[PDB]
Design an enzyme around this catalytic site. Structure first.
Site, PDB file in Angstrom:
ATOM      1  N   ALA A  15       1.617  56.912  13.699  1.00 60.92           N
ATOM      2  CA  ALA A  15       2.458  55.874  14.286  1.00 60.92           C
ATOM      3  C   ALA A  15       2.401  54.574  13.483  1.00 60.92           C
ATOM      4  O   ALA A  15       3.405  53.858  13.382  1.00 60.92           O
ATOM      5  CB  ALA A  15       2.026  55.623  15.730  1.00 60.92           C
ATOM      6  N   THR A 154       5.684  60.817  15.964  1.00 63.69           N
ATOM      7  CA  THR A 154       5.412  60.680  14.538  1.00 63.69           C
ATOM      8  C   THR A 154       4.144  61.439  14.180  1.00 63.69           C
ATOM      9  O   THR A 154       3.142  61.343  14.892  1.00 63.69           O
ATOM     10  CB  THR A 154       5.237  59.195  14.128  1.00 63.69           C
ATOM     11  OG1 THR A 154       6.363  58.436  14.590  1.00 63.69           O
ATOM     12  CG2 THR A 154       5.121  59.071  12.599  1.00 63.69           C
ATOM     13  N   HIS A 218      -1.199  64.031  32.064  1.00 65.08           N
ATOM     14  CA  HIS A 218      -2.314  64.703  31.397  1.00 65.08           C
ATOM     15  C   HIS A 218      -3.433  65.110  32.335  1.00 65.08           C
ATOM     16  O   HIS A 218      -3.929  66.245  32.199  1.00 65.08           O
ATOM     17  CB  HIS A 218      -2.848  63.828  30.259  1.00 65.08           C
ATOM     18  CG  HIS A 218      -2.045  63.949  29.010  1.00 65.08           C
ATOM     19  ND1 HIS A 218      -2.435  63.407  27.801  1.00 65.08           N
ATOM     20  CD2 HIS A 218      -0.831  64.510  28.798  1.00 65.08           C
ATOM     21  CE1 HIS A 218      -1.504  63.653  26.893  1.00 65.08           C
ATOM     22  NE2 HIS A 218      -0.518  64.313  27.475  1.00 65.08           N
TER      23      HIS A 218
HETATM   24  N1  NAP Z   1       2.036  59.546  17.035  1.00 57.38           N
HETATM   25  C1  NAP Z   1       2.780  59.831  18.233  1.00 57.38           C
HETATM   26  O1  NAP Z   1       3.811  60.376  18.190  1.00 57.38           O
HETATM   27  C2  NAP Z   1       2.158  59.386  19.574  1.00 57.38           C
HETATM   28  C3  NAP Z   1       2.472  60.087  20.704  1.00 57.38           C
HETATM   29  C4  NAP Z   1       1.939  59.731  21.883  1.00 57.38           C
HETATM   30  C5  NAP Z   1       1.070  58.636  21.952  1.00 57.38           C
HETATM   31  N2  NAP Z   1       0.742  57.932  20.822  1.00 57.38           N
HETATM   32  C6  NAP Z   1      -0.170  56.771  20.967  1.00 57.38           C
HETATM   33  O2  NAP Z   1       0.164  55.873  20.081  1.00 57.38           O
HETATM   34  C7  NAP Z   1      -1.157  55.261  19.423  1.00 57.38           C
HETATM   35  C8  NAP Z   1      -1.205  55.621  17.925  1.00 57.38           C
HETATM   36  O3  NAP Z   1      -1.282  57.070  17.853  1.00 57.38           O
HETATM   37  P1  NAP Z   1      -1.325  57.856  16.382  1.00 57.38           P
HETATM   38  O4  NAP Z   1      -0.581  59.200  16.578  1.00 57.38           O
HETATM   39  O5  NAP Z   1      -0.759  57.033  15.310  1.00 57.38           O
HETATM   40  O6  NAP Z   1      -2.797  58.256  15.845  1.00 57.38           O
HETATM   41  P2  NAP Z   1      -4.222  58.475  16.662  1.00 57.38           P
HETATM   42  O7  NAP Z   1      -4.627  59.970  16.572  1.00 57.38           O
HETATM   43  O8  NAP Z   1      -4.009  58.040  18.060  1.00 57.38           O
HETATM   44  O9  NAP Z   1      -5.391  57.516  16.018  1.00 57.38           O
HETATM   45  C9  NAP Z   1      -4.954  56.179  15.687  1.00 57.38           C
HETATM   46  C10 NAP Z   1      -6.149  55.446  15.048  1.00 57.38           C
HETATM   47  O10 NAP Z   1      -7.292  55.458  16.106  1.00 57.38           O
HETATM   48  C11 NAP Z   1      -8.449  56.209  15.437  1.00 57.38           C
HETATM   49  N3  NAP Z   1      -8.928  57.125  16.473  1.00 57.38           N
HETATM   50  C12 NAP Z   1      -8.409  58.169  17.140  1.00 57.38           C
HETATM   51  N4  NAP Z   1      -9.392  58.594  17.947  1.00 57.38           N
HETATM   52  C13 NAP Z   1     -10.490  57.799  17.756  1.00 57.38           C
HETATM   53  C14 NAP Z   1     -11.711  57.868  18.380  1.00 57.38           C
HETATM   54  N5  NAP Z   1     -12.313  58.737  19.392  1.00 57.38           N
HETATM   55  N6  NAP Z   1     -12.670  56.984  18.050  1.00 57.38           N
HETATM   56  C15 NAP Z   1     -12.422  56.014  17.106  1.00 57.38           C
HETATM   57  N7  NAP Z   1     -11.207  55.950  16.490  1.00 57.38           N
HETATM   58  C16 NAP Z   1     -10.228  56.863  16.833  1.00 57.38           C
HETATM   59  C17 NAP Z   1      -7.888  56.928  14.532  1.00 57.38           C
HETATM   60  O11 NAP Z   1      -8.829  57.144  13.424  1.00 57.38           O
HETATM   61  P3  NAP Z   1      -8.605  58.458  12.369  1.00 57.38           P
HETATM   62  O12 NAP Z   1      -7.151  58.665  12.107  1.00 57.38           O
HETATM   63  O13 NAP Z   1      -9.390  58.199  11.105  1.00 57.38           O
HETATM   64  O14 NAP Z   1      -9.176  59.679  13.057  1.00 57.38           O
HETATM   65  C18 NAP Z   1      -6.592  56.060  14.010  1.00 57.38           C
HETATM   66  O15 NAP Z   1      -7.064  55.108  13.005  1.00 57.38           O
HETATM   67  C19 NAP Z   1      -2.150  55.755  20.132  1.00 57.38           C
HETATM   68  O16 NAP Z   1      -2.332  54.811  21.297  1.00 57.38           O
HETATM   69  C20 NAP Z   1      -1.660  57.079  20.729  1.00 57.38           C
HETATM   70  O17 NAP Z   1      -2.254  57.256  21.929  1.00 57.38           O
HETATM   71  C21 NAP Z   1       1.270  58.288  19.631  1.00 57.38           C
END
Ligand code: NAP
Ligand code: NAP
EC number: 1.5.1.-
Lengths: 418, 418
Positions: A15, A154, A218
């Site tokens: 994202a 994304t 969830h």
């Molecule tokens: N991408 C989508 O389509 C989507 C969909 C639904 C919700 N979201 C929400 O949008 C936000 C961004 O999501 P994202 O998909 O870009 O990636 P992400 O998997 O949520 O992780 C984003 C960042 O947080 C770190 N992270 C994840 N879990 C962690 C943990 N237990 N402890 C410490 N750091 C942690 C990750 O580090 P690492 O990457 O190094 O592991 C990354 O730098 C989040 O709030 C997610 O919940 C995104």
């Protein structure tokens, strides 16, 4: 001008690549990026030191407003103690159950020009919690904005390349003042309007956060007995999160938990002075619709007044209709890391943290949430049984504790102060 | 001895091949076979004049009690006026909505030793109707036996070769006297026991016929608006009879018709002095079960006392669970015959006839069946619209009339005489 503010994005999941492109497309702003020193973070740290460029592609319908793009990163860090300097906007792109741990590591004194903190995918209570921390650091001036969810879909692993398959139709947001006309709100709207995403302002932070779909959906699916069994017995044939029994959790008891947990959040929100959402209208009209031959407009409009059993029937029909790409979402299992320590996957780990924080808050406010309590009791017993099978010494510390207690206390303190 | 009685099977669909093998395996009996002079009948007539042998194979689970078998046919006819001689048992293996047309063509006077008439796959009222006709021909002595349904799943096209994929777990039957211990009943039991099929005797013919699944399930599914549209607009992409909208008819309104039609049959049966079935127990426990995590034992046992909305929820859950090989059943469309005349396929043509006969009977008895009436009104309007599109002169006469009126009258006459 708000579309030129130096912006530091905390967390570099996929994202953040979409977000970074969207900011760069909306104005000429210096862009910083943080990611913890995981193996993925290290590889991205190395890559960027050579070529500080992220890449994004639009896909399927998202291709209408997102083509092949690239965006330059001006500063990359992997220690939050290095989150310092003239940054005027921080965007928390880590999951909401990690806002606290992140914000506690930021040296606020070293951000003299900080103007705004944006919660990219908030949870209920996130904004109150962040307000409280900022107020303690002398940053009561800073604008706190909660977005109801991330605004797209994304995905990556080349950690500097992402692709977006779809954009959401609307996002709910608010700052702590309920001030719809702020420059930051206008800037966010402009940023999201490039993808035809509507922005809907709310009276306060909680009144936007109440539109976080994953808090509703969830826990009933992910914490169902059969889903917990797939999670904690990794050798079983895979389950699917949205399928009906026996391939996934959907069944009348699970739907009864979905409806009951929505009842619980209404109790908690109402206690906090916030109106409950219409769950079925939100699911259908703000997220993913199903034919009216399955779920009638009457069921949608009148859902909050329907009797429980009819609410449940409507929700079972909704999730059945959905499966005709929800059917592809697998239930992830426990797994070992490089040091052979066992972890929970982000589903349900994030959901357990978010719901436990709210359950602790409700208890402090004399609010009972029996479905939330049943769901967490069931999870905790299964987790305890798993830790005994594998040994506590072989479990990652995330399996053994959390800081939900401190968060619930902070949120309660901030809310009572108003 | 009843397992040596010369037996004439009327109708030579694939079930008759299974039946013929089952009779020949149970005793040494002369076997006759009738089939109308369709193109298929003619080809079977030709084949048998050369080699009077039918062939059957067991398949999947049926292979446990059915292997490769052959059975000799001693007499084959294609005109019912030739249904004469020393035959002591007639078995009606044509569909129930054709019993009347068949029985009216049989020269009863030329069957001096006739002892029994068996209705292989009956409908409600079939037995009363057959009694009435036999009584008019001076055959009140003849034993009339209704079976609740055909006892297997059997399919062909080489018209002298069939295969059986599965046997039913139980069949309900009765003769007009409710006499469970008759030699014919014992013979039928012996015949079905070779495949581990239980036989359950009932107090009267209707008390067995009430267990005909297709009278309950077909009209709501087959006569749904979207199914009628697929039926009468043959160029649409195919629909599936048991799938949820938009791939098939299953949806809350259709389930509401399933529950309402069961209510209607309870009204009619009760008026006729017969207890209604438990529809959900019958579907689950006598036909095809689903996991208790989808449909609880409470829902099954208490179904008749559940409120309508809960009945409906339970049935929607049941049909959803069923699809996890119902999903392969296509909705058949109107079609032209060799003379370019338009026909309805047997689904819904047979179901419309069976339900219209009962609706006419109910009206004669001052019983209202609003769901049955709505279903037939909807069918009739769609049929009228189709006939106008293609032209009445281009429709087979089966599209333009039926003898349901005479049947309802006969059934009413027989029932009142008791
Ligand atoms: N991408 C989508 O389509 C989507 C969909 C639904 C919700 N979201 C929400 O949008 C936000 C961004 O999501 P994202 O998909 O870009 O990636 P992400 O998997 O949520 O992780 C984003 C960042 O947080 C770190 N992270 C994840 N879990 C962690 C943990 N237990 N402890 C410490 N750091 C942690 C990750 O580090 P690492 O990457 O190094 O592991 C990354 O730098 C989040 O709030 C997610 O919940 C995104
Ligand atoms: N076979 C199964 O697994 C199964 C499953 C469910 C119910 N059943 C029931 O069991 C009975 C036997 O079924 P079946 O599968 O053996 O074959 P079928 O398709 O029901 O036909 C049986 C005989 O009736 C004739 N027939 C069918 N439709 C007719 C019509 N409109 N007008 C005049 N004659 C007609 C057929 O002639 P032609 O063959 O020459 O066309 C055939 O001789 C029927 O009561 C059926 O409803 C059977």
């Amino acid at each position: 001008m708000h579309n030129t503010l130096p912006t530091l994005i905390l967390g570099a999941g996929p994202a953040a690549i979409q977000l970074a492109v969207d900011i760069s497309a909306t104005g000429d702003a210096r862009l910083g990026l943080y990611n913890r020193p995981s193996t993925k973070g290290e590889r991205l740290k190395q890559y960027l030191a050579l070529t500080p460029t992220l890449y994004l592609q639009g896909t399927g319908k998202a291709q209408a407003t997102q083509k092949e793009s690239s965006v330059t990163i001006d500063c990359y860090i992997d220690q939050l103690a290095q989150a310092v300097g003239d940054w005027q906007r921080l965007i928390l792109a880590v999951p909401a159950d990690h806002y606290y741990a992140v914000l506690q590591q930021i040296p606020w004194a070293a951000l003299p020009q900080l103007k705004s903190v944006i919660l990219l995918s908030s949870s209920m209570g996130s904004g109150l919690m962040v307000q409280n921390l900022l107020n303690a650091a002398g940053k009561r001036d800073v604008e706190v904005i909660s977005l109801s969810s991330y605004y797209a879909d994304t995905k990556y692993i080349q950690p500097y390349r992402a692709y977006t398959k779809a954009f959401k139709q609307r996002i709910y947001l608010a700052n702590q003042w309920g001030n719809a006309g702020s420059a930051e709100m206008s800037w966010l709207t402009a940023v999201l309007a490039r993808h035809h995403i509507d922005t809907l302002p709310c009276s306060n932070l909680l009144a936007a956060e109440r539109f976080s779909i994953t808090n509703y959906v969830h826990p009933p699916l992910a914490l169902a007995d059969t889903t917990l069994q797939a999670l904690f017995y990794p050798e079983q044939r895979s389950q699917y999160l949205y399928k009906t029994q026996p391939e996934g959790p959907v069944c009348p008891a699970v739907i009864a938990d979905l409806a009951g947990l929505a009842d619980d959040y209404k109790r908690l929100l109402n206690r906090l002075g916030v109106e409950e959402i219409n769950l079925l209208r939100f699911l259908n009209d703000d997220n993913y619709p199903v034919p009216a031959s399955m779920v009638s407009r009457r069921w949608i409009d009148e859902f909050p007044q329907l009797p429980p059993l009819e609410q449940q029937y409507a929700l079972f029909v909704r999730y059945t209709a959905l499966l005709v790409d929800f059917s592809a979402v697998k239930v992830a299992t426990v797994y070992q890391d490089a040091n052979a320590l066992w972890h929970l996957p982000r589903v349900p780990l994030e959901d357990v943290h978010k719901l436990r924080t709210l359950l602790l808050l409700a208890g402090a406010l004399d609010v009972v949430m029996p479905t939330a309590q049943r769901l967490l009791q069931r999870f905790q017993q299964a987790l305890k049984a798993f830790i005994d099978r594998v040994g506590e010494e072989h479990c990652h510390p995330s399996l053994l504790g959390d800081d939900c207690d401190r968060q619930a206390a902070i949120i309660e303190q901030q809310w009572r102060s108003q």
